[PDB]
Design a protein around this ligand. Structure first.
Ligand SMILES: CCCCCCCCCCCCCCCCCC(=O)OC[C@H](COP(=O)(O)O)OC(=O)CCCCCCCCCCCCCCCCC
Ligand SMILES: CCCCCCCCCCCCCCCCCC(=O)OC[C@H](COP(=O)(O)O)OC(=O)CCCCCCCCCCCCCCCCC
Ligand SMILES: *[C@@H]1O[C@H](CO)[C@@H](O[C@@H]2O[C@H](CO)[C@@H](O)[C@H](O)[C@H]2NC(C)=O)[C@H](O)[C@H]1NC(C)=O
Ligand SMILES: *[C@@H]1O[C@H](CO)[C@@H](O[C@@H]2O[C@H](CO)[C@@H](O)[C@H](O)[C@H]2NC(C)=O)[C@H](O)[C@H]1NC(C)=O
Ligand SMILES: NC(=[NH2+])NCCC[C@H](N)C(=O)O
Ligand SMILES: [Ca+2]
Lengths: 458, 200
């Protein structure tokens, strides 16, 4: 991989289903067009300053996983255990639930033209996408990657149609929605903070950039150069798509809209308006099919330290797929969509993710006072992880002191419930602990035909 | 009532509150100070047949009309024009000459007015006086309610049966073509255009 083809993996991973779902709730919190475009630019700065901090840790430590070896080197085994627990039950199944709910908003919306589709059709079509993707990825290890090339191709076709059609209509003089852009706004730290949650969901994927892009012709120069080029190129596409929405829509019509891209495609492309619910739905299950490939990489290394059940990250003998980890992610994702509601799963995902984004970036500053003699090839200026830590404190504390809703309580009570399991199964190796786990490991092994992966660390 | 910018600020403000706006539309007649009528009575171009003109015998300051048809507000529905030296038809007042909807140029002009206000963002129309749109071209006299009444005294509108001046064959097809014009602005979902008719 060169430099130019290193940009292609960064852009193709970050651009997903977020730009088709998030513009309604960024505008709903900052109720003007002017501050709505400031937020979509400021999340592009947080995503590039966050990915530069992860690029330093990824060449410093050189152990696979996610944030798990970065948290173990800085604090010890307690926040490393809490990351593998909170990514097992909170972070990874809610990501799979938001995407499959985003697929169902776009399949159902052209059949309800001036109307709102009922929640039972949105949820029972999103549940059929979770079960179908979990069945395909648990049987056909090579089939998920062949169709991924035509899902990436359908994704950046509909992105280029929206960006170009917005520049043509803006040239003809359709600029009357940007006239008094800063009248009617919120300087509230609960409304600004929730516009950052939904804006940073569309930028999600900047922290998984470390591992699959170490295969470059000259790392330690081409990796930090792929972040300064790759993610501000995504920020240029996200601002241009939101400008393209406000040329055909008022800020009031965008709030009263089920799917924001089927409303755009009804005013611009009339005799072929069905290509927007067709390509966005292909782009969305391509984003859900991609996450089931790496299911088990963090599970395996956390099980090696004894911080995770080892019956997960077993491999089926026929159809060499990580079938226990894929089936477990599908069960928690169908449980999350029954209370459901995108704008409640986005706040639930973003509170847990940015609690641990700010712990590894603070761990970068801890490892400069505690962990010298450590051979840093990439080295950031020290003010970049300082402000990225303080912004992560703002994204955690401000929702619970301004607009405390009930999903922020279930997210705390599920993370700290893992803190009890640390003191009963890791810290105090009780005798009745492995009297339970290996009976479950042995019987699930014969039920699914799954073996230990014929694989050591590397 | 204001300017065109006042109307455009009102349509935008109605839409930000989630409301809809319908306006009246008058297809049957214009004022006699309309530019089409000032061109019609000098026989200028295509505008000669925009209104319904017929020969009459105006002498001694009084007009002998082509038939006995009466205005709704009550006297003869024909008025002599001195420049054209013919009589024109009006259903309501002599300052309101009726358009000739048997002329396809007139039907094209009404459609361009509808497209003008639909482009401004008006959500629909209320059509006034659609039953008065067409009249019989044979121009025969109406039947009196009282047949022994002397026709010099038949001046009130309620003294005639209006079989030839209201609801003629072809009127409903003109209203259906108005609905077809508005259907080209109704294809986007959530932006259906309303058409109501008034006939009392
Ligand atoms: C209400 C809240 C709680 C809800 C909980 C609901 C739980 C529902 C579980 C449903 C499981 C569905 C599994 C089928 C998924 C098929 C996906 C697929 O394509 O497979 C390919 C895979 C390919 O196999 P092949 O066809 O043989 O090649 O098929 C299977 O492996 C099917 C094996 C079924 C696996 C069932 C696993 C159930 C585990 C339950 C263990 C519980 C232990 C609890 C002990 C407690 C002790 C304290
Ligand atoms: C195929 C999908 C199912 C397979 C995976 C689940 C297996 C079924 C058993 C479920 C758990 C049964 C009780 C725990 C048994 C192990 C206890 C133990 O002694 O650990 C030793 C264990 C080591 O065992 P070893 O792997 O045998 O060495 O120590 C630990 O791993 C500590 C970490 C425990 C992590 C617990 C994970 C529990 C997953 C289910 C969570 C349910 C809530 C989901 C979220 C709420 C709904 C939204
Ligand atoms: C047409 O109707 C009008 C009614 O406005 C008649 O005009 C005058 O009506 C008033 C009553 O309000 C009488 O006092 C006048 O004597 C009427 N004028 C004349 C000249 O008689 C009018 O008579 C009707 N007929 C015509 C042919 O104009
Ligand atoms: C209207 O019709 C009536 C009869 O239908 C005409 O004749 C008058 O009828 C009344 C009935 O009570 C007699 O009292 C009158 O003597 C009749 N003759 C008249 C008024 O000349 C009547 O002429 C018709 N026309 C009008 C204008 O009323
Ligand atoms: N690991 C993941 N796939 N996370 C979700 C990525 C979401 C993606 N950035 C989007 O625009 O929707
Ligand atoms: Ca008429």
């Amino acid at each position: 991989l060169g430099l130019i083809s290193g940009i292609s993996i960064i852009v193709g991973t970050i651009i997903g289903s977020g730009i088709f779902v998030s513009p309604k709730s960024v505008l709903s919190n900052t109720e003007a067009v002017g501050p709505c475009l400031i937020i979509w630019a400021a999340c592009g700065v947080l995503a590039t300053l966050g990915a530069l901090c992860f690029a330093e840790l990824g060449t410093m430590i050189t152990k696979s996983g996610g944030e798990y070896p970065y948290l173990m080197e800085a604090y010890g085994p307690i926040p490393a255990y809490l990351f593998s627990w909170a990514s097992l039950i909170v972070i990874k199944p809610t990501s799979f639930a938001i995407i499959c709910l985003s697929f169902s908003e776009y399949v159902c919306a052209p059949f309800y033209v001036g109307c709102k589709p009922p929640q039972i059709v949105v949820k029972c079509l999103a549940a059929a996408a979770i079960l179908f993707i979990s069945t395909v990825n648990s049987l056909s290890v090579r089939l998920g990657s062949y169709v991924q090339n035509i899902f990436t191709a359908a994704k950046l076709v509909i992105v280029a149609i929206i960006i170009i059609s917005g520049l043509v209509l803006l040239a003809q003089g359709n600029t009357k929605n940007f006239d008094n852009s800063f009248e009617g706004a919120q300087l509230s730290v609960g409304a600004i903070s929730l516009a950052f949650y939904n804006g940073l969901w569309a930028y999600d994927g900047w922290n998984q950039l470390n591992y699959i892009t170490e295969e470059l012709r000259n790392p330690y120069r081409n990796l930090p150069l792929a972040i300064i080029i790759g993610i501000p190129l995504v920020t240029a596409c996200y601002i241009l798509m939101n400008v393209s929405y406000f040329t055909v829509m008022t800020a009031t019509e965008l709030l009263q809209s089920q799917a924001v891209a089927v409303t755009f495609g009804d005013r611009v492309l009339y005799p072929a308006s069905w290509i927007v619910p067709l390509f966005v739905a292909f782009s969305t299950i391509g984003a859900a099919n991609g996450t089931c490939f790496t299911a088990g990489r963090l599970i395996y290394v956390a099980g090696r330290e004894g911080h995770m059940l080892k019956v997960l990250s077993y491999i089926s003998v026929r159809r060499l797929t990580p079938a226990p980890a894929i089936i477990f992610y599908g069960i928690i994702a169908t449980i999350y969509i029954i209370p459901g509601d995108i704008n409640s799963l986005v706040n639930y995902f973003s509170f847990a993710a940015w609690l641990f984004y700010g712990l590894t970036i603070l761990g970068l500053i801890v490892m400069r006072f505690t962990r010298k003699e450590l051979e840093r090839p990439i080295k950031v200026p020290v003010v970049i992880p300082v402000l990225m830590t303080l912004i992560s404190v703002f994204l955690v504390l401000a929702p619970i002191i301004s607009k405390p809703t009930w999903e922020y309580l279930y997210c705390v009570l599920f993370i700290l419930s893992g803190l009890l399991f640390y003191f009963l199964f890791v810290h105090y190796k009780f005798g009745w602990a492995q009297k339970i786990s290996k009976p479950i490991t042995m019987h699930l092994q014969m039920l699914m035909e799954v073996v230990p992966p014929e694989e050591d660390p590397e | 009532f204001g300017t065109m910018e006042d109307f455009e600020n009102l349509v935008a403000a109605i839409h930000d509150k989630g409301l809809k706006l319908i306006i009246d539309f008058i297809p049957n007649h214009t004022s006699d100070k309309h530019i089409w009528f000032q061109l019609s009575r000098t026989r200028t171009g295509k505008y000669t047949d925009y209104y319904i003109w017929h020969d009459c015998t105006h002498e001694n300051g009084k007009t002998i009309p082509p038939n006995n048809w009466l205005s709704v507000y009550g006297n003869s529905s024909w008025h002599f024009d001195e420049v054209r030296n013919q009589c024109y038809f009006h259903q309501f007042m002599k300052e309101q000459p009726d358009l000739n909807f048997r002329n396809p140029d007139v039907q094209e002009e009404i459609k361009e007015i509808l497209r003008f206000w639909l482009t401004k963002g008006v959500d629909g129309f209320s059509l006034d006086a659609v039953k008065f749109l067409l009249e019989a071209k044979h121009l025969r006299d109406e039947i009196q309610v009282n047949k022994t009444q002397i026709p010099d005294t038949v001046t009130q509108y309620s003294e005639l049966y209006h079989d030839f001046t209201t609801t003629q064959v072809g009127m409903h097809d003109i209203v259906r073509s108005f609905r077809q014009t508005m259907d080209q602005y109704s294809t986007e979902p959530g932006r259906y255009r309303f058409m109501g008719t008034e006939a009392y």
